[PDB]
Every structure is written in C-alpha cells, then in structure tokens.
Design a protein around this ligand. Sequence first.
Ligand SMILES: [Mg+2]
Ligand SMILES: [Mg+2]
Ligand SMILES: [Mg+2]
Ligand SMILES: [Mg+2]
Ligand SMILES: [Mg+2]
Ligand SMILES: [Mg+2]
Ligand SMILES: [Mg+2]
Ligand SMILES: [Mg+2]
Ligand SMILES: [Mg+2]
Ligand SMILES: [Mg+2]
Lengths: 80, 90, 67, 199
Amino acid sequence: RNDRKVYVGKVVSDKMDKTITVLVETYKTHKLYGKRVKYSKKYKTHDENNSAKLGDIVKIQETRPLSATKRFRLVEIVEE
Amino acid sequence: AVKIRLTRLGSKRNPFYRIVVADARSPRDGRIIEQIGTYNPTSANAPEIKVDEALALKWLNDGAKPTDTVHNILSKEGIMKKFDEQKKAK
Amino acid sequence: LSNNIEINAYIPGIGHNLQEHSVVLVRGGRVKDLPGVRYHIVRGALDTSGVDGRRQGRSLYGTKKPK
Amino acid sequence: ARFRGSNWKKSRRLGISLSGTGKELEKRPYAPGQHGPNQRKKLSEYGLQLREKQKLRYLYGMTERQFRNTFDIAGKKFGVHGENFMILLASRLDAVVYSLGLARTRRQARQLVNHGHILVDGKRVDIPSYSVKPGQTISVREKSQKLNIIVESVEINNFVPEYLNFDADSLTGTFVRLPERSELPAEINEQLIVEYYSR
RNA sequence: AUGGAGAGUUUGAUCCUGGCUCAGGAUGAACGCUGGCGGCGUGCCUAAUACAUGCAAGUCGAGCGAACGGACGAGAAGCUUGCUUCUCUGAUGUUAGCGGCGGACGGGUGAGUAACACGUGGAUAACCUACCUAUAAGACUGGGAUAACUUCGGGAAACCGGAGCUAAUACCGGAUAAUAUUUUGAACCGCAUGGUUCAAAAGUGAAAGACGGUCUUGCUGUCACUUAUAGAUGGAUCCGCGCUGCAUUAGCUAGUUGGUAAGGUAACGGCUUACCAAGGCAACGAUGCAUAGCCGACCUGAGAGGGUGAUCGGCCACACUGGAACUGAGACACGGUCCAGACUCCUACGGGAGGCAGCAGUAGGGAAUCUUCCGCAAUGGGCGAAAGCCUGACGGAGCAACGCCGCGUGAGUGAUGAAGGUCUUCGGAUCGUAAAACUCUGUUAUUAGGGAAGAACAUAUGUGUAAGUAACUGUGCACAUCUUGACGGUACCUAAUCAGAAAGCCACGGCUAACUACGUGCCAGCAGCCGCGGUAAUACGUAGGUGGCAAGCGUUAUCCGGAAUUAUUGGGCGUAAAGCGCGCGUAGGCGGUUUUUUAAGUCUGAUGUGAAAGCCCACGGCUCAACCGUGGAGGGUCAUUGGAAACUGGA
Ligand SMILES: [Mg+2]
Ligand SMILES: [Mg+2]
Ligand SMILES: [Mg+2]
Ligand SMILES: [Mg+2]
Ligand SMILES: [Mg+2]
Ligand SMILES: [Mg+2]
Ligand SMILES: [Mg+2]
Ligand SMILES: [Mg+2]
Ligand SMILES: [Mg+2]
Ligand SMILES: [Mg+2]
C-alpha cells in the first residue's frame, strides 16, 4: 500500500561494485533575498547488475539500509 | 496500562478537569493520548460534565480503564450502562 | 571587583566615608569629565554611607527620610 | 477617591471644570502656584496632547495605569478609537452612578460604589472600575435607601442623559444603550489623546 | 487597510554626509528611598560547587512456612471461685523472612551534544512491547532443594561462615498444544530484497494455585496462571527538507567507501571480523576550531525582520567521574550491582561506609532568589480482591511589591480667602476649599456572631436488571443509604465603633510636563547628549510652588525600536567612506527572435497533518479585572494527489 520516495537523477560515479551514486538536483530559494539557487544532493543507490553507467539519467527508490550509506535501489534507466 | 482519567487545569482553589485517555505512566497534566470531555465540579452548585460518547465507548472497548471519578462521571452520563449492555449482548 | 577586575568608580554626592579596603557596590555609568572613570559607587550600600544633609532626590544618594 | 487632592487646583491647571459647575474657574481661571498669575507661556504640541489627556483622566478620576489600560481595550473595539474610548469611560459604574444623580459629585459617587451602597442587577458591586453594559439596572442598597446624601442628590433634579433611564421613586436607573459623542462631554478632543498615546 | 511621528549635537551662518545621544516597550532582575491590603502568577539565571540532618518506593497474610500473640471458652480450688497453672481449644490480629509486582514511572538538572539531537513530512516487505482489552484452546502427572528457624564458631561495626530441619502462585523432569522452525506442493499479490493464504508431513516445552458458594469433593464464582492470533499502549530504526560562527581553518578519510562470506542484533546495516577492490567526503564549505540542549513558544518591530529558549507542555541528554554487564517486558538503571578514579567519613586499627542536578535545609559563590511547614481531603501513580498502605508527585499553607490586576489611604458643604510657610513692586500673590468647623460613609481596620463550595467517590448495606449456572455465592450495570477536608472556622455574610491606624518617589535649561528665593562662587558639586558652576545659577544644595507617577518611584544591567546606521522590503561608491593600476581568462551569475514538446520552478483545487497550552476574535464564570474555562481563527519553505502552459528551466 504505502509507497516509498522515488527520485530521478544523473549518475556521477560507478567505480563501486553494484553501487552507483545519483546526483539529484534541486533549487532551494534563499530565505531572505528570494533568489533561486542550485542545490545538488548525491544519493547512493543499489545497482545489482551494474546496468547503469556514468552519465545516464536513472530512477531510484528508497529502501531499507543496504550498506553504511546506501538507502536507495535502481528502478529503471529513464535515459542514457 | 491505558487509562481514562482527569487532568487538572484552572487555578488555585478553582480546579477544572479535562477528561483524557492517557498512558498511566505519563505525568498528570502531561502527555495524553486523546481528550474526550470536561468535568467542572464547581459550576453552578452542580458538577458540569461534557463527554463524547463515541470516543468513550471506543476507548472502553479498546481497553482503557477509567478511574473512580471518571467511572462515576461516565455512569452519570449513561456511558457505562451502554458499554455494559453492548458487552453483554455482543 | 568580585571578578578581580580593577576599575575606577566615581563617588557621587557631597562628602563620603570611604577609605582603602572599604567594600562598595559598583554600578554602570561613566563620568564624562573623568577619562578612565566608567562606573559609579552606589551610596547607602555595603560600607558606603548616605550623603549627609541631603533632602531632595535622596534615593539617588542613599539617604534615609529625615522626618 | 484614589487621588485625594485639590480638585480646584486641578481644574485651574487644566482650564476645565472637573465638577462641571465652573466654580473653580469663576474667580481664578489661571493655573495654581507662585507663577499662576501672569502666566503667559505657550504650550508645545506635546504639552497640548498631555493637557487633553490629563483633562479626561482627572475628569473621570482614574489613575494613569487604569486609564491607559482602558484606552488600550477601547482601541480593540470596532469604530473610531477616540469615540470608543470616551463611551467606554462613560460606561464605568462611577460615571453611571454620577449621571443617574445618586451623588452630587463624581468622587462622592465613587465612594458610594466603593462602600457598596449600589447594586447592579440586584447584586453588590464594590469596584468603581466596573464597566456597565446596556440592558443592566443600577439600584441602591436597602440599608442605605434613606441616606441623607443620596436622598438630597435625588431631590436635586439633575439632567439624565438619553442612554440612561432613571426613576427616582425606586432609585432605579437603567443603562439603555451605549452613549454617543454628542451626549459625552464636548470639552475633550479625543483625537489629541489618541495621538498622545501614539507618541 | 486597524498599520509606520521624531529630537539634540560638527558652522560665523548654510545645505549635505556622518556617527554619538535621547524620548517607547520588555525582565526570573538587582540596588536606593519608601511601603496599606486582596486576587492570580513568579522566585539560585552564579558553583553539573561540597553537602550535616529529616523525609522523597513501597505494597501484597485472599502465594508461602515460621514466630509472637492471645479472645470465645475448657479443667483443680489455692476455700482468693477469682484468680490459677498446662493437659487443651485456641479466634480477631501483628510481624523478620521466602515469593510476586513496583523500584526503567513519577521528580531533578541542562553538563555533554553541531548530531536524524530537535522540528516538519514520510517510510519499515528490517523491528520489539509487562500490565490492559477481545477471541480460541488449556491448566495433566511427578520430583529435589532453600530462606526463615535451631545449633557451633568468628566480629567494634558492617555482618560473616559450618552443621541440621521446613514451605509455597519459589525451582526442575515428563505428558498433549501450535500461524513459531525445516522440507514439499498449490493459489494469489507487490514498493528489488519479497508479501498473504491453503494443504502435507518431521523435529516440539506451557501452566498454579488462593479465597469463597453449592456440597453430591462432583459442579462452580472471583482473582491468579499458560499457549496463539488480533487491538490498544509504549519503544526502536531509516529517510527528504529545515535548523551556527569562523577560511587569520583547504584538504579530510584506511573499517575509511563498495562487494563477497560468516558472526551478531528486536531489527537492516562495516554493526563486527576474514578476503578483494580503491573507493568515500569536500569551495553546494569537507576537516578543524569555538560556542550551544532543540521545539511549542517568549520580547520587540507597522511589517520584513531582530533578540531570546525562565515558569508551563513535548522531545533529547545526564545521575560524584569513567567502563561494564546483571535482573527484567522494558535499564546498560538518580535514592541497584561490579570494577577503576578523585574526594570524604567511621574504626576497638582487625577493618568498614558514602554520592541532594528529589523536597526542605547547611556551607560556599554571588548584586540576587523562600519553609529543615501541613495532608494524602482532591487529581494522578505503585501494590492489594478490598478496607487500606506508600506517594516532598501533587493539593495547600509560610516568606519575598518580584510581576500583573483590583481597592484604599475618605466624601459633601465650606471665603470668613483664618493662622503659618514662600515670594513681593510691601498694595498683594501663592500654598487654598487647602485648612478650621457642620454633615455623611465604613471600602478598609478592630470587636462579636453565622459560615460554603471544592466531596466524586471507593468500601459497606439494601434491592432491580444481564451473561453464565442444574441452582447459589459471586461478576457487569442501575437506583438508594451511613461515612470521608490539610487548607480551616480560611473565603464569604451579618451587627457595632472610629476619619480615626494607611503616601511615597523622581523631575522642573532644550530634548521634556513643570519656576522663583536664598547659600555657593570654575569651589563644593551636576551631567543621557549639548553642556552647567568664577556674585543676577529656572542646570550645583536647601526652601516654597509646580509636573509626572503613585504602593510604588528612581538608578543600574540586558534585548528590540527609533537606526533606511548592512538598506529583500529599504542605501551607496566624480569631490563626503567606497571602482581592484590594467589585461587574459576558469567556475559561477546572467543572457537575442520564432515554432513544437516537457511540467523542475511558476499558478490553482482536494485530502492528511502542523499536539495541548500560548497570541488574536467571541462567549461564559470569579462582585470587576487580572485570571480561569469553552469555541473560533491563525501558524508549512509541509506531504500526497488532480489540473494550466504565459515566463524562467529541460528537449
Ligand atoms: Mg552547555
Ligand atoms: Mg522599522
Ligand atoms: Mg532506580
Ligand atoms: Mg540522591
Ligand atoms: Mg536541593
Ligand atoms: Mg555571599
Ligand atoms: Mg534595521
Ligand atoms: Mg574619498
Ligand atoms: Mg580604474
Ligand atoms: Mg495548538
């Protein structure tokens, strides 16, 4: 029933075995001056078969802890 | 043990109780689970009482046990009789 | 002071009974004429005596009501 | 009252008859003190606002703290702040009793209510600060129905404003409705007091 | 629309710039002078400094043996039939001890913590949960010990051992029971891992009795006990976002980052270990350093913002310092254990003991913060079937003008302008309707009477009704009755007596409301800024008068405002402070016109949530108000979901 968060982002490193780091990009607004400023967050996601490659836009979903800092699993490769 | 009890409010020499379902271990006047009514024993020379029958019955069925004063208040409101009848005829 | 800091404190009023080793109460407020005097000594507190012969604005100089 | 002072000197200072008769200003309409006579200085804007505020405050015989609090609560009402403040001051039990005429002076009415000779809706009220409201009745204590002062004031037939409906046979007054600016004293420019409390 | 004030001061004079200063609001305040009362709040902010003394966690005899105790009432007559022993019965009771439950709550504190600690929104198909509630099934059959107790020995004490004996709802074996574990098949489903249901088998342990009713030891009530599945409660973990200063801190990391295997945990996981690889973080501020409990809220401001994190509620963390585990559903445990450490105490010198950041209180520190008080009567909690016991939680009282709110210190008449003070132009002016005097009142105060509510109950005693019974006693519910107050004879009410007991503080040159006389003579002294004082001082001190406040008034300290004086709202850089001496150029910021498309920003609707208290609005109750209570409104940069395509972003 209850679903888990899903994010879309680019792959920025895959040197780790079966792990890819996904950079999700957002734009937080400055609290006083109100300007739009870029905000990047890197997500460590599980890539069982090493399908994803450095550069492709992939999709990840939140899971239980899988490692010291892995909390996401690769769902599909939206683009490449 | 979940319980239905009186949490004190008002002022010195002027108590006013709220009727609350709260864990027994929580402080009096502290954390509660859910309020169901109010009980003023110094109003118009007759204790003013307000209770939500639906919530009272739900908590009685769940297992919350009133205290002495709350049991008397629910008896006066007739909630105890309805709970007993439902339990007997379930 | 009780915090071991050494300051200069003005003695307000006319005439005072203060000497070395007197224990005094010090409040803020500098004396514009006096360069390094940045505090005032309260009158009528601890050792410091009230101003003798003061009758107007006594509370400012720690003088009891004569009556 | 709380301010137990020379009401004549206060009237002379503020250039207003706090009693309403004018006796204080009849002979010496100038300020008290050594420099009273031959006084010709001109008040500043702050001085004028302060004088207006003091006129109203000493007219109603209140202390500064209570006056300020009443002004604050009046400001929260819908309408014109100054008019609301004036009507709220009028609604005080002191003012209602004095207008009904159970005493010849505002301070006398204050002492009456303080000593409990008055009843609102048939119940004792010792606090002159009490804020009367429309639809209520002011009576007199039975043990004090035959007081010389109250009976003499009732005999002296004073004008009863429109917002008060009085019957001297029963010594019973009724607060019919809220007053109006015209009914309330016109010697006060409430805008000056509003600005005074603005700064 | 509910909402926004300025002034002094640079000059001979001016405009500008510019800082400094003042008028407002606030406080857990302190101090000086003064001080009548009531109501409601608040009261060690410093030394997470050390602590004398008392108290702050017990309860259960209806789980258990034992001991003490001895009714009701036996026997001989001491010829005392009212006093008596043991040969009895021995009930109502009490207890040290075993056992159960509670000591993980309640209360204190903010040291540590810059971190998923906290706030907000989510997730767990990675989780645990005593007591409570519901349902279903059970509670069968045996056994060995031990405390207490008696005895012997050693101790100043703490208390220790050896021997012997005895209980249980204490402990243990076996029997039957599984949705738990292993294997096989089948059905369906989802967010990878996987989840739900059914059918087969194999391994497989649970439990307890106590007090009563009916008495047929058969049935049976209440409580208690065991297994399973749900509910409720409570706890755990993970994640997005938010949440602080410094670059005169630029590199950090080696179980570190990932994978494999195993171990470990309620649980997933480098959580730990072994192996392989060299990964991981960081100018979107890593690391380091400093400081800090976070929030609801609180102060201020027109707002935007700025400051704060007392009292009250939530969350966290800690319990002399450090480490550890035990028991337990739950702790790595404030008034538990062990070890180490510092410190302190007692001792017969052999050896022992302790942890107020619980409530009071002591010492100390400090400008500064209270009683070694009363009661469990109310609310809440633990134990008990219950009466009841415990409860420094809590409910009260005591102290402190510490704050807010309310009421006093009198009211009417009173020219005859009385005396007297001060000034004077020597006529008078002023204190002044002030006073005197006559009349009035008793809020307050003194005296004497009456006197609440807060109290619901629980239990006990009567009935009625409902499930079950073969039928009672009981159990749930309903209606009645006796009894229950620390505060306290307090609040409040009544009657009598007296204006009699109850006004002080600051200021008066401008800002800024309020002026004169004496003394002084750049002295004494004042001062927030500008300044004042050398003989005519409204600025120093006193006096009269006046102004502002008033049981308070001033001073000091700190915060916001005024300050558009860090300027998003809302400022600037020719000469006032401010354009790098100038190129070339990286990251970043920003970017010409049209068409199609996307929906990240942007706009709009629905749902959930943003606790309670608080602020604001309304209403109701204290005689009013503060205060209290009840509704409403508000507060997200919040999340999920459905819509639009102009602009920014992407194609
Ligand atoms: Mg700290
Ligand atoms: Mg502003
Ligand atoms: Mg403990
Ligand atoms: Mg302790
Ligand atoms: Mg203490
Ligand atoms: Mg000291
Ligand atoms: Mg500003
Ligand atoms: Mg220049
Ligand atoms: Mg240049
Ligand atoms: Mg709320």
